[PDB]
Design an enzyme around this catalytic site. Structure first.
Site, mmCIF file in Angstrom:
data_model
loop_
_atom_site.group_PDB
_atom_site.id
_atom_site.type_symbol
_atom_site.label_atom_id
_atom_site.label_comp_id
_atom_site.label_asym_id
_atom_site.label_seq_id
_atom_site.Cartn_x
_atom_site.Cartn_y
_atom_site.Cartn_z
ATOM 1 N N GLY A 1 3.557 7.875 -0.849
ATOM 2 C CA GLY A 1 2.988 9.044 -1.517
ATOM 3 C C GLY A 1 1.479 9.055 -1.460
ATOM 4 O O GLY A 1 0.875 8.104 -0.986
ATOM 5 N N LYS A 2 0.895 10.169 -1.904
ATOM 6 C CA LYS A 2 -0.547 10.364 -1.975
ATOM 7 C C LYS A 2 -0.998 10.130 -3.408
ATOM 8 O O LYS A 2 -0.365 10.609 -4.349
ATOM 9 C CB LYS A 2 -0.925 11.803 -1.596
ATOM 10 C CG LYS A 2 -0.804 12.135 -0.124
ATOM 11 C CD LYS A 2 -1.149 13.595 0.143
ATOM 12 N N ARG B 1 -4.998 9.805 -5.651
ATOM 13 C CA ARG B 1 -6.226 10.578 -5.810
ATOM 14 C C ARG B 1 -6.943 10.687 -4.468
ATOM 15 O O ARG B 1 -7.314 11.780 -4.045
ATOM 16 C CB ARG B 1 -7.130 9.922 -6.857
ATOM 17 C CG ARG B 1 -8.257 10.802 -7.353
ATOM 18 C CD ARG B 1 -8.890 10.188 -8.595
ATOM 19 N NE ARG B 1 -7.913 10.040 -9.668
ATOM 20 C CZ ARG B 1 -7.597 11.013 -10.514
ATOM 21 N NH1 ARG B 1 -8.186 12.192 -10.410
ATOM 22 N NH2 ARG B 1 -6.698 10.810 -11.460
ATOM 23 N N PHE B 2 -7.118 9.543 -3.811
ATOM 24 C CA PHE B 2 -7.661 9.465 -2.461
ATOM 25 C C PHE B 2 -6.706 8.610 -1.643
ATOM 26 O O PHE B 2 -6.052 7.709 -2.179
ATOM 27 C CB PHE B 2 -9.051 8.817 -2.458
ATOM 28 C CG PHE B 2 -10.059 9.540 -3.299
ATOM 29 C CD1 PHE B 2 -10.793 10.590 -2.768
ATOM 30 C CD2 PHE B 2 -10.271 9.175 -4.620
ATOM 31 C CE1 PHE B 2 -11.723 11.268 -3.538
ATOM 32 C CE2 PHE B 2 -11.205 9.851 -5.404
ATOM 33 C CZ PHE B 2 -11.931 10.897 -4.858
ATOM 34 N N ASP C 1 -8.712 5.040 -15.208
ATOM 35 C CA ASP C 1 -7.590 5.910 -14.844
ATOM 36 C C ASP C 1 -6.231 5.249 -15.056
ATOM 37 O O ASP C 1 -5.320 5.367 -14.223
ATOM 38 C CB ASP C 1 -7.728 6.396 -13.393
ATOM 39 C CG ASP C 1 -6.855 7.624 -13.099
ATOM 40 O OD1 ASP C 1 -6.443 8.323 -14.050
ATOM 41 O OD2 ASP C 1 -6.583 7.887 -11.914
ATOM 42 N N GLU D 1 -3.518 7.584 1.087
ATOM 43 C CA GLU D 1 -2.075 7.735 1.156
ATOM 44 C C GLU D 1 -1.439 6.340 1.202
ATOM 45 O O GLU D 1 -1.968 5.469 1.883
ATOM 46 C CB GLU D 1 -1.792 8.476 2.443
ATOM 47 C CG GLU D 1 -0.439 9.014 2.562
ATOM 48 C CD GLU D 1 -0.360 10.127 3.597
ATOM 49 O OE1 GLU D 1 -1.098 11.141 3.457
ATOM 50 O OE2 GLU D 1 0.450 9.983 4.534
ATOM 51 N N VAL D 2 -0.326 6.126 0.488
ATOM 52 C CA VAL D 2 0.294 4.805 0.401
ATOM 53 C C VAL D 2 1.523 4.728 1.303
ATOM 54 O O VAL D 2 2.344 5.651 1.318
ATOM 55 C CB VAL D 2 0.640 4.393 -1.060
ATOM 56 C CG1 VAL D 2 1.248 3.007 -1.103
ATOM 57 C CG2 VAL D 2 -0.603 4.410 -1.947
#
Ligand SMILES: O=C(Nc1cc(Nc2c(Cl)cnc3c2OCO3)ccn1)C1CC1
Length: 301
Positions: free
Chosen positions: A15-16, A18-19, A136, A21-22
């Site tokens: 998934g994406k 904040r900055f 965060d 992509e994983v």
């Protein structure tokens, strides 16, 4: 040539955030997690690499960092952060999928608190670790390990403290994180951002919200709540700062603590912790260390 990104094969999009992509990848046959940034996200990638490479950061409740690296596919360069992979994924996903026992709830809460207290703790010495605030913290940024403990991830917005000269290592901007989890003083921009303790106190408010998410899924005699995000009952999906401010600052509401939680001692302790994370004044909130001590004592009982 390179020994990290060069030899890792990506297998599945996670998934994406904040900055970047994983991805799930394989490094010598072993599963690893990879966060990939583009060239134009270099500053975010570098900052997160910088935080993960902080001396003495490694801790069972912080996501295990393997390496920062570059990979050139022949057309463009990718900027990689490689970490441990955890099959369960995020605490958010886990709590959506499953209910937890009292023991399971305590394991998740204590491990999260231990991670945060480690981030927050200055360790003196030649190989000393500065105090770090996350900025965060949320259930989507905490991963659940196979042993049922948590580790904290997504350290790209973190701030580090120099205790000696009393300076934060970056010039922080207001309201960088996830709006739903912003503390009251972040929501109304009143937070004193020259004061490092204020960032710690803001993290504690967010952790309180995560504890509420967990406690809801603690099933006793088959009885539990459905998964919800904090403030599900009061703000829209993807709420604005104004929507959040109206609920949290003006109306002064916090997530509801169900009556059934007073009937079980573990839930009673958790509910008390939440309240003492949720004061509008950060100086009144519990510390991560105190919360860890309370949960450690509880898990012994
Ligand atoms: O998603 C799963 N596992 C998983 C996801 C991770 N996410 C992240 C985050 Cl949140 C932040 N920074 C990162 C990550 O990976 C690299 O840097 C990490 C490890 N394991 C399993 C459900 C398939």
């Amino acid at each position: 040539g390179g020994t990290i990104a060069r030899t890792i094969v990506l297998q599945e999009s996670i998934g994406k955030g904040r900055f970047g992509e994983v991805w799930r990848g394989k490094w010598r046959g072993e599963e690893v997690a990879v966060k990939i940034f583009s060239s134009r996200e270099e500053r975010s990638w570098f900052r997160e690499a910088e935080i993960y490479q902080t001396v003495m950061l490694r801790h069972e409740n912080i996501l295990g960092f393997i390496a920062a690296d570059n990979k050139d596919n022949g057309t463009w360069t990718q900027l990689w952060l490689v970490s441990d992979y955890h099959e369960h994924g995020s605490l958010f996903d886990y709590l959506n999928r499953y209910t937890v026992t009292v023991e399971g709830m305590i394991k998740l809460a204590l491990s999260t608190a231990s991670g945060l207290a480690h981030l927050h703790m200055e360790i003196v010495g030649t190989q000393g670790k500065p105090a770090i605030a996350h900025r965060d913290l949320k259930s989507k940024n905490i991963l659940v390990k196979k042993n049922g403990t948590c580790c904290i991830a997504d350290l790209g917005l973190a701030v580090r403290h120099d205790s000696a000269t009393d300076t934060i290592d970056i010039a922080p901007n207001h309201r960088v994180g996830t709006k739903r989890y912003m503390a009251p003083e972040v929501l109304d921009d009143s937070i004193n951002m020259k004061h490092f303790e204020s960032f710690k106190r803001a993290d504690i408010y967010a952790m309180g919200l995560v504890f509420w998410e967990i406690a809801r899924r603690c099933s006793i005699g088959g009885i539990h709540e459905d998964y919800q995000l904090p403030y599900y009952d009061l703000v829209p999906s993807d709420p604005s700062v104004e929507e959040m401010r109206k609920v949290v600052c003006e109306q002064k509401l916090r997530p509801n603590i169900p009556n059934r939680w007073q009937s079980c001692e573990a839930l009673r302790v958790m509910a008390k912790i939440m309240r003492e994370c949720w004061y509008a004044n950060g100086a009144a909130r519990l510390t991560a260390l105190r919360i860890k001590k309370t949960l450690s004592q509880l898990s012994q009982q």
